[PDB]
């Protein structure tokens, strides 16, 4: 029953005119609860989950103020990085940042993180010990030395181990009706004849939460990966997720195949077999 809180930030430079596009989203496990879009009219941090709207004005004023400070830092960074990499000013670039904390099943601090990327590749990241930094290249190296002298890690560690975890627990309690509830996948199987001698069996997993799940096909009690297809887990759009796995089999032998579903909301894994 571990949980986590994470903030994602993306900034895209626009050399033609104006400031970078800035977008920030906040999540608790697989549930988004806040967002900020520089392109939006409010210019304020906004709610994306019912249970977060319980927070008062001081909350939203503080979060708004802070998220704007985040965008300005990203604006400055885009400039600093263009220099480090000796890049033209005519091209658009991207900086991304993600940070957060996890609490174990004991609801105690488990781990924290703070990673950074430039143009889609790792740049610099705080190591699990939350004291050292991992720099991907010499540009990141200069940042590392600067953050080590400024003791940036110590400041982040205090947040990740303290503030971060404290608010995560607060949110978990306020939105317990959903955040602390698991939605077991709703499953069924479909049959589609692809020829006079072959058929496709598709195992469906629907409306489940959290997203983490495992679907596996077995033939006569043995895992089978040959002639199978597994799509990536996808959002239903209503907060839940979907996934399916298919296998091509000889018409008339459908009984040999079983679909196994593992999910946190299932006391024990489910096994499905064609009618």
């Amino acid at each position: 029953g571990s949980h986590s809180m994470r903030y994602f930030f993306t900034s895209v430079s626009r050399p033609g005119r104006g400031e970078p596009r800035f977008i920030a989203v906040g999540y608790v496990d697989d549930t988004q609860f806040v967002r900020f879009d520089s392109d939006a009219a409010s210019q304020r941090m906004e709610p994306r989950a019912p249970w977060i709207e319980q927070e008062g004005p001081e909350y939203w004023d503080g979060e708004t103020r802070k998220v704007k400070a985040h965008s300005q830092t990203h604006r400055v960074d885009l400039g600093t990085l263009r220099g480090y990499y000796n890049q033209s000013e005519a091209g658009s670039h991207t900086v991304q940042r993600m940070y957060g904390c996890d609490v174990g099943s004991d609801w105690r601090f488990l781990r924290g993180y703070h990673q950074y990327a430039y143009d889609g590749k790792d740049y610099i990241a705080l190591k699990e010990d939350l004291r050292s930094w991992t720099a991907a290249d010499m540009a990141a190296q200069t940042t590392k030395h600067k953050w080590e002298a400024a003791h940036v890690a110590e400041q982040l560690r205090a947040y990740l181990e303290g503030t971060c975890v404290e608010w995560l627990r607060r949110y978990l309690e306020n939105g317990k009706e959903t955040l602390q509830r698991t939605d077991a996948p709703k499953t069924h199987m479909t049959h589609h004849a692809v020829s006079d001698h072959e058929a496709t069996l598709r195992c469906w997993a629907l409306s489940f939460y959290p997203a983490e799940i495992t679907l596996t096909w077995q033939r006569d009690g043995e895992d089978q990966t040959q002639d199978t297809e597994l799509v990536e887990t996808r959002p239903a759009g209503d907060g839940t997720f979907q996934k399916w796995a298919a296998v091509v089999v000889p018409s008339g032998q459908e009984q040999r195949y079983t679909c196994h579903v593992q999910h946190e909301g299932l006391p024990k894994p489910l096994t499905l077999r064609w009618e």
Partner: peptide, 9 residues
């Protein structure tokens, strides 16, 4: 809740 200070690269 977001972190308060965000150092520049």
């Amino acid at each position: 809740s977001l972190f308060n200070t965000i150092a520049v690269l």
